[PDB]
Amino acid sequence: ANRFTSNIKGLTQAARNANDGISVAQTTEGALSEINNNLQRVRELTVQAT
Amino acid sequence: SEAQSRIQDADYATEVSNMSKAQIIQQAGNSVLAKANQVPQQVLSLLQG
Amino acid sequence: QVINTNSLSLITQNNINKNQSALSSSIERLSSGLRINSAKDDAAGQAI
Amino acid sequence: TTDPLKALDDAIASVDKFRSSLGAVQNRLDSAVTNLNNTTTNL
């Protein structure tokens, strides 16, 4: 039972840690989407300029 | 004048379509917002029993 | 007769947490209007 | 005043430069606002 308790606590903390990776991924994805929009407008401007 | 018309003026069909799309998006999103705001209530039911 | 563990409640919470993701996805799709709203959705659809 | 129309043309171009830079800054700030909103929600 002591080993079971240790495993349960460790796994719960592991899931808590796992959520942080999802948060980081979401933030970086939003930033990359903004960069994508900027690049798209730059491409449109270049098409107009050439 | 024709060139400036092809440059600066807007196409009314496209603008009307965009306005309609934006209006429908706003209304739908606001209804879903109302549903999401109604979501948290079941915790009160859990507490009361 | 154990009351120090109520496993039935644990199963119910697990099912509710499972449903949570689908509910959130449905709300997000309805609000945004796009089925590919993130790379987790398809991302091949997103690239194309 | 000699070559008046050239003077007016360069003045108009000089104010157009400022206007274009200002609009670019506007778009810059709007994109910054949107990214900040997304980051705040994630945090």
Q: Which two tokens mark A34?
A: 């903004």
Q: Which chains touch D (3 or more CB pairs under 8 A)?
A: A
**Which SS3 state, helix, strand or coil, does residue C38 take?**
coil
Which of B32, B39, B42 to probe by mutation at the C interface, max C CB count within 10 Å?
A: B32
* Separation between Cα atoms, residue A15 and residue A28, nearest integer Å: 20
Assess contact for C29 and C37: CB atoms under 8 A. yes
Nearest to C32 by CA among C44, C24, C21: C24
Q: Which two tokens mark B39?
A: 């979501």
- Experiment type: cryo-EM
* Separation between Cα atoms, residue B38 and residue B43, nearest integer Å: 11
Which parts of chain C are beta strand (E)?
Answer: none
Q: Which chains touch B (3 or more CB pairs under 8 A)?
A: C
Q: What is the largest CA-CA distance in chain C?
A: 57
Which of C5, C34, C38, C42 to probe by mutation at the A interface, max A CB count within 10 Å?
A: C38
User: What residues of chain A lie within 8 A of the CB of C39, using their CB?
Assistant: 29
Task: Say whether A38 and D35 touch across the interface (CB within 8 A).
Answer: no
Residue type, A37: N
CA A33 to chain centroid: 12
**Which SS3 state, helix, strand or coil, does residue D1 take?**
coil
